[PDB]
RNA sequence: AAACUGAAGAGUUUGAUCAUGGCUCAGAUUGAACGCU
RNA sequence: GGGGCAACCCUGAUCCAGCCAUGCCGCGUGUGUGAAGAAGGCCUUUUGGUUGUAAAGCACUUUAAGCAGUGAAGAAGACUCCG
RNA sequence: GCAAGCGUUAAUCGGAAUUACUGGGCGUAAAGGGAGCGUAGGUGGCUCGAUAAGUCAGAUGUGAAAUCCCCGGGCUUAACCUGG
């Protein structure tokens, strides 16, 4: 499987998070990388995590048409 | 293709003997040209420009060897691609043509003679390892070393091979072929040196030539 | 132009049109002579350069020259025609090939015979 | 099924084959699962003209690909030899 | 303001060699006393020594070599600025004339040569080059 | 033993109140084969004799030069005012790749094998002057290893 | 063992110069067409 | 590859064949010897030069093309008899 | 000079460091915004730790075959085919 850890960025939606995760791309001509935010849209069972929490998913298959993660751990809450 | 056109411009042109025709009497007095460039003009004025002495180096070298632009520029090519030096590589594979070899032990008195008689598969070459000898019409073909070469039982008498071989005597017999001349056998166990191959020849200007 | 500059903006290679437009990227092009006149060329130079203005089959109203010395071309000739400007002729873009389909060869040329369709003498 | 098959390669009047293991369906020239060995039909006696691997060939036997009768004569002829 | 360190001692070093001073002194930091070593090891500068001054400051002090009336260093050019890092494998670090120079490189294993990187099969940032 | 290679033919026009004037100027680059080279220029009304005078020059600047065996120790890049010349050794039996002026200063130096570039302006004076600064500039690893107090084995 | 081999410029703005700057040629190439053969 | 227990049938896939110099490669259109340097053409200071060993003469050689033969390999052994 | 070919034309890259990451410039040749402020974004002082994401190194799988390249083999040579 694969995990990718990411601040959720709205809670808004009922039993749904979304989460953004930064990666870093080397640009092939000029060879420097750029930050890179993607947003990927999960599947919270409890609302356990508000917006702004640092989440980790893993892919599963799809629950609905947009989602195709699950939150498996919460690691740090916001202040 | 083979030039049909005299053989002698040629040399003239290029201001030094090609070896086109075999030396029975002396070049000079043969012809009495080439002291000049050929045609009516002669001697003239605006000097050759040193790409115009790359041309006439690689012509010179083209014209020696009987070998069209197209099979030369694919022997630099080879040359290139293949390791060491790339003028070294190209003389040697000239050196290595069939014509040229059996031209050099003498069957043939000039190399047109040779690579005529080799188009006609009188000669014929076994590869190292074979056991049975097969004709072939290709003079143009590399011969790996250790090759051996023989005349076929019809050429055996043949009155122009024995003229030649005594020119060919005079003239000298290269140190890497053998022959054995009451057998018309000839062994090419190693290809010629750059330092055996003729010093005035510049193998410079052709790399030159081709790099643009 | 810093390497931040070239990542968010980059370099642009603006691309040159073709300088024959009438044959559509291809090698000829049949047209139908619909005028065959003479034209007087640039400053430097005084002639009478023997032109066509043809209309190709794509489509546009083009100008051609007619080399050689004397041609049989005429209203409602058909005609072959390749690029290449004339320097002295402003406006004509194209060359007539002579010889092709009904632009006749130059009748006594010996030199460049292949390059204004004359055959070989016998 | 999977049946293992010469695949025709080589130059005109000079055929070269290929033994591959591929799907039934598609064509000889097509995508093939594996290669296991080459078939030379004119060769030198000291040239090798057929080469396989007995070890994949005894492995899609057990898995179940139905060998073309071609192939199985060739295979028979290289375990005798 | 002063967004590189690195490229400020390398700099400072060829202004003073192409002013022809003896030493010359800068701030310290562990990075640049650590490439000021490895130039002290490859012989382009006679020494390098960091007296630790008030405040919890240090001053790197680098002692210039001058060969035949010349400067020793012919060139030092910073390569991983800032702006675009450089980072290059094992078998492709650059250079420097033919060898005969020095690319310093930045490996997991401390500051070293090239060479000596090239030795170790490891790689890393290259930081510059120095001739 | 010296070779003198003629560069490049020039004629020049002076202007003076009653009418034109034509001179010619003409550089040549004279050396000794394997480690002395010069470049001179000459002007003269008569073109032999600008070749002579820019022989002159040559010969009083000669510098000397250091090569292994047939080509250049390392990659030289060179810039005088607006011309850049680059070039980079090359293995035996490549030859001189160079456009002219380069190749004659080369084939004076008796570099057999090299590998040329030109940026920027393609003036055949200042290519000259920009590869002989290069030249000038290049250093052995022998001398490189005295510069560092170090032994030639312990620097690659 | 090998795969690690590769870099040319020129004509043209001026009485003449250097730079800059465009335009043009020298090469390879092609499912190629047209002309002589 | 499809169907059939097999015999065998279908297969414009496939293997080949006809046309095109359309690209690449190879080969041939001959090879030696040949002077008051024949004749003619061209240039010329009108007499020399050049075409030019080029040619004629002379002695060979027959790859390719054409004729007469000869003759592999692409074939995997079907079926049938026997253990 | 090429040679069963030879040229012209059409197109692509090269030469063109003439879009310059390798590898260009901006006082006068084209080019500093009229000046400040500041959003996103880009970069960023010294010392001691945790972390190992970028970075480097090694292991595995994969990155089809052909084609490119190297070394051998077969066609009389070559193109061509072909094992590794």
Same mark, same amino acid.
């Given at each position: 499987?694969?995990?990718?850890?990411?601040?959720?960025?709205?809670?808004?939606?009922?039993?749904?998070?979304?989460?953004?995760?930064?990666?870093?791309?080397?640009?092939?001509?000029?060879?420097?990388?750029?930050?890179?935010?993607?947003?990927?849209?999960?599947?919270?069972?409890?609302?356990?995590?508000?917006?702004?929490?640092?989440?980790?998913?893993?892919?599963?298959?799809?629950?609905?048409?947009?989602?195709?993660?699950?939150?498996?751990?919460?690691?740090?809450?916001?202040? | 293709?083979?030039?049909?056109?005299?053989?002698?411009?040629?040399?003239?042109?290029?201001?030094?003997?090609?070896?086109?025709?075999?030396?029975?009497?002396?070049?000079?007095?043969?012809?009495?040209?080439?002291?000049?460039?050929?045609?009516?003009?002669?001697?003239?004025?605006?000097?050759?420009?040193?790409?115009?002495?790359?041309?006439?180096?690689?012509?010179?070298?083209?014209?020696?060897?009987?070998?069209?632009? @197209?099979?030369?520029?694919?022997?630099?090519?080879?040359?290139? @691609?293949?390791?060491?030096?790339?003028?070294?590589?190209?003389?040697?594979?000239? &050196?290595? @043509?069939?014509?040229?070899?059996?031209?050099?032990?003498?069957?043939?008195?000039?190399?047109?003679?040779? @690579?005529?008689?080799?188009?006609?598969?009188?000669?014929?070459?076994?590869?190292?390892?074979?056991?049975?000898?097969?004709?072939?019409?290709?003079?143009?073909?590399?011969?790996?070393?250790?090759?051996?070469?023989?005349?076929?039982?019809?050429?055996?008498?043949?009155?122009?091979?024995?003229?030649?071989? &005594?020119?060919?005597?005079?003239?000298?017999?290269?140190?890497?072929?053998?022959?054995?001349?009451?057998?018309?056998?000839?062994?090419?166990?190693?290809?010629?040196?750059?330092?055996?191959?003729?010093? &005035?020849?510049?193998?410079?200007?052709?790399?030159?030539?081709?790099?643009? | 132009?810093?390497?931040?500059?070239?990542?968010?903006?980059?370099?642009?290679?603006?691309?040159?049109?073709?300088?024959?437009?009438?044959?559509?990227?291809?090698?000829?092009?049949?047209?139908?002579?619909?005028?065959?006149?003479?034209?007087?060329?640039?400053?430097?130079?005084?002639?009478?350069?023997?032109?066509?203005?043809?209309?190709?089959?794509?489509?546009?109203?083009?100008?051609?020259?007619?080399?050689?010395?004397?041609?049989?071309?005429?209203?409602?000739?058909?005609?072959?025609?390749?690029?290449?400007?004339?320097?002295?002729?402003?406006?004509?873009?194209?060359?007539?090939?002579?010889?092709?389909?009904?632009?006749?060869?130059?009748?006594?040329?010996?030199?460049?015979?292949?390059?204004?369709?004359?055959?070989?003498?016998? | 099924?999977?049946?293992?098959?010469?695949?025709?390669?080589?130059?005109?009047?000079?055929?070269?084959?290929?033994?591959?293991?591929?799907?039934?369906?598609?064509?000889?020239?097509?995508?093939?699962?594996?290669?296991?060995?080459?078939?030379?039909?004119?060769?030198?006696?000291?040239?090798?003209?057929?080469?396989?691997?007995?070890?994949?060939?005894?492995?899609?036997?057990?898995?179940?690909?139905?060998?073309?009768?071609?192939?199985?004569?060739?295979?028979?002829?290289?375990?005798?030899? | 303001?002063?967004?590189? %360190?690195?490229?400020?001692?390398? %700099?400072?070093?060829?202004?003073?060699?192409?002013?022809?001073?003896?030493?010359?002194?800068?701030?310290?930091?562990?990075?640049?006393?650590?490439?000021?070593?490895?130039?002290?090891?490859?012989?382009?500068?006679?020494?390098?020594?960091?007296?630790?001054?008030?405040?919890?400051?240090? %001053?790197?002090?680098?002692?210039?070599?001058?060969?035949?009336?010349?400067?020793?260093?012919?060139?030092?050019?910073?390569?991983?600025?800032?702006?675009?890092?450089?980072?290059?494998?094992?078998?492709?670090?650059? %250079?420097?004339?033919?060898?005969?120079?020095?690319?310093?490189?930045?490996?997991?294993?401390?500051?070293?040569?090239?060479?000596?990187?090239?030795?170790?099969?490891?790689?890393?940032?290259?930081?510059?080059?120095?001739? | 033993?010296?070779?003198?290679?003629?560069? !490049?033919?020039?004629?020049?026009?002076?202007?003076?109140?009653?009418?034109?004037?034509?001179?010619? +100027?003409?550089?040549?680059?004279?050396?000794?084969?394997?480690?002395?080279?010069?470049?001179?220029?000459?002007?003269?009304?008569?073109?032999?004799?600008?070749?002579?005078?820019?022989?002159?020059?040559?010969?009083?600047?000669?510098? +000397?030069?250091?090569?292994?065996?047939? +080509?250049?120790?390392?990659?030289?890049?060179?810039?005088?005012?607006?011309?850049?010349?680059?070039?980079?050794?090359?293995?035996?039996? !490549?030859?001189?790749?160079?456009?002219?002026?380069?190749?004659?200063?080369?084939?004076?130096?008796?570099?057999?094998?090299?590998? !040329?570039?030109?940026?920027?302006?393609?003036?055949?004076?200042?290519?000259?002057?920009?590869?002989?600064?290069?030249?000038?500039?290049?250093? +052995?690893?022998?001398?490189?290893?005295?510069?560092?107090?170090?032994?030639?084995?312990?620097?690659?």
């Amino acid at each position: 499987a694969s995990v990718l850890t990411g601040r959720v960025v709205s809670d808004k939606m009922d039993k749904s998070i979304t989460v953004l995760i930064e990666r870093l791309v080397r640009h092939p001509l000029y060879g420097k990388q750029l930050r890179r935010s993607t947003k990927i849209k999960a599947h919270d069972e409890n609302n356990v995590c508000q917006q702004g929490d640092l989440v980790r998913i893993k892919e599963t298959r799809p629950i609905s048409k947009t989602k195709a993660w699950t939150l498996v751990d919460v690691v740090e809450k916001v202040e | 293709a083979r030039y049909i056109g005299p053989k002698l411009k040629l040399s003239r042109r290029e201001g030094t003997d090609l070896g086109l025709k075999s030396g029975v009497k002396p070049y000079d007095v043969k012809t009495k040209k080439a002291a000049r460039p050929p045609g009516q003009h002669g001697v003239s004025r605006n000097k050759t420009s040193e790409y115009a002495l790359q041309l006439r180096e690689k012509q010179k070298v083209k014209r020696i060897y009987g070998v069209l632009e @197209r099979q030369f520029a694919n022997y630099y090519k080879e040359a290139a @691609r293949k390791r060491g030096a790339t003028g070294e590589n190209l003389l040697a594979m000239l &050196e290595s @043509r069939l014509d040229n070899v059996v031209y050099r032990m003498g069957f043939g008195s000039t190399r047109a003679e040779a @690579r005529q008689l080799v188009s006609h598969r009188t000669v014929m070459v076994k590869k190292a390892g074979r056991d049975e000898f097969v004709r072939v019409n290709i003079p143009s073909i590399q011969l790996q070393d250790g090759d051996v070469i023989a005349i076929q039982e019809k050429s055996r008498e043949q009155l122009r091979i024995k003229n030649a071989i &005594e020119l060919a005597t005079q003239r000298g017999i290269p140190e890497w072929l053998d022959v054995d001349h009451s057998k018309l056998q000839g062994t090419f166990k190693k290809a010629p040196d750059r330092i055996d191959l003729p010093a &005035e020849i510049n193998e410079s200007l052709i790399v030159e030539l081709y790099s643009k | 132009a810093t390497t931040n500059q070239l990542i968010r903006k980059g370099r642009k290679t603006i691309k040159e049109k073709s300088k024959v437009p009438a044959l559509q990227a291809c090698p000829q092009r049949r047209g139908v002579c619909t005028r065959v006149y003479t034209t007087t060329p640039k400053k430097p130079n005084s002639a009478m350069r023997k032109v066509c203005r043809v209309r190709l089959t794509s489509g546009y109203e083009v100008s051609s020259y007619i080399g050689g010395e004397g041609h049989n071309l005429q209203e409602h000739s058909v005609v072959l025609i390749r690029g290449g400007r004339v320097k002295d002729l402003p406006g004509v873009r194209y060359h007539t090939v002579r010889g092709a389909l009904d632009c006749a060869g130059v009748k006594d040329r010996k030199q460049g015979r292949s390059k204004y369709g004359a055959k070989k003498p016998k | 099924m999977v049946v293992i098959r010469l695949a025709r390669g080589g130059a005109k009047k000079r055929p070269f084959y290929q033994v591959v293991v591929a799907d039934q369906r598609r064509a000889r020239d097509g995508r093939y699962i594996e290669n296991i060995g080459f078939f030379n039909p004119l060769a030198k006696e000291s040239e090798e003209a057929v080469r396989l691997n007995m070890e994949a060939y005894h492995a899609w036997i057990a898995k179940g690909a139905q060998p073309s009768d071609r192939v199985a004569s060739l295979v028979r002829a290289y375990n005798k030899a | 303001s002063m967004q590189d %360190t690195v490229g400020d001692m390398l %700099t400072r070093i060829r202004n003073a060699q192409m002013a022809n001073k003896v030493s010359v002194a800068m701030p310290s930091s562990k990075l640049r006393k650590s490439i000021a070593d490895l130039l002290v090891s490859e012989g382009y500068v006679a020494s390098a020594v960091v007296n630790a001054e008030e405040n919890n400051k240090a %001053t790197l002090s680098i002692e210039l070599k001058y060969f035949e009336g010349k400067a020793v260093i012919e060139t030092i050019q910073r390569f991983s600025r800032p702006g675009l890092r450089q980072h290059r494998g094992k078998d492709a670090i650059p %250079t420097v004339k033919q060898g005969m120079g020095v690319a310093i490189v930045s490996t997991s294993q401390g500051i070293m040569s090239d060479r000596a990187a090239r030795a170790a099969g490891i790689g890393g940032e290259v930081v510059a080059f120095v001739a | 033993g010296l070779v003198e290679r003629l560069v !490049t033919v020039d004629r020049v026009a002076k202007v003076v109140k009653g009418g034109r004037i034509f001179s010619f +100027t003409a550089l040549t680059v004279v050396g000794d084969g394997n480690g002395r080279v010069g470049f001179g220029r000459g002007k003269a009304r008569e073109v032999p004799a600008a070749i002579q005078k820019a022989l002159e020059a040559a010969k009083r600047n000669m510098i +000397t030069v250091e090569l292994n065996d047939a +080509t250049l120790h390392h990659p030289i890049k060179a810039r005088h005012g607006a011309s850049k010349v680059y070039m980079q050794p090359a293995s035996e039996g !490549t030859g001189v790749i160079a456009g002219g002026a380069m190749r004659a200063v080369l084939e004076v130096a008796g570099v057999k094998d090299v590998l !040329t570039k030109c940026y920027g302006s393609t003036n055949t004076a200042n290519v000259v002057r920009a590869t002989f600064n290069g030249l000038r500039d290049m250093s +052995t690893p022998e001398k490189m290893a005295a510069k560092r107090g170090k032994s030639v084995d312990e620097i690659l």
